[PDB]
């Protein structure tokens, strides 16, 4: 397991250093999106929660295709606001329920160090 806690203050720095196998070693789900919501990275822990194949969701749109329950002011709205302001860093509870059993989670969204890149981190609650 990679030695990284969900919600860490410097999580973006740690993950900037990681390859795919490393991201798959995290204790929590990790998705990297571009500013339009297209899926750049998706780790094994996230697929364990959602039943999505991390190898195949890459390239799809998280808000339009994969996770319509997040296409809402409460999730997508916060993403959009943080992308626009340039300082995305927000945490909230949510329920994921499209093509998976309804699952309560805690979500942390945070701007990545690489350009036009934004993390969505997920753990069960
Ligand atoms: C609601 O439709 C949420 C769906 C979902 C959330 C997170 C994922 O990684 C995959 C699907």
From Swiss-Prot:
Regarding how it is modified after translation, the entry says: The 4-hydroxycinnamic acid (p-coumaric acid) chromophore is covalently bound via a thioester linkage.
Domain PAS spans what residues?
23-86
**Organism domain of life:** Bacteria
Ordered alphabetically, the record's keywords are: Chromophore, Photoreceptor protein, Receptor, Sensory transduction
By sequence similarity, the record places it as follows:
Belongs to the photoactive yellow protein family.
Q: How does it assemble?
A: Monomer.
Name of the protein this chain belongs to: Photoactive yellow protein
């Amino acid at each position: 397991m990679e030695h990284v806690a969900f919600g860490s203050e410097d999580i973006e720095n740690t993950l900037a250093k990681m390859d795919d196998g490393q991201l798959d070693g995290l204790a929590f789900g990790a998705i990297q999106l571009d500013g339009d919501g297209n899926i750049l990275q998706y780790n094994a822990a996230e697929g364990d929660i959602t039943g999505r194949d991390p190898k195949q969701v890459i390239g799809k749109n998280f808000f339009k295709d994969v996770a319509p329950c997040t296409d809402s002011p409460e999730f997508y709205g916060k993403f959009k606001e943080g992308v626009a302001s340039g300082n995305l860093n927000t945490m909230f509870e949510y329920t994921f329920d499209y093509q998976m059993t309804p699952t309560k989670v805690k979500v942390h969204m945070k701007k990545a160090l690489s350009g036009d890149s934004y993390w969505v981190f997920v753990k069960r609650v």
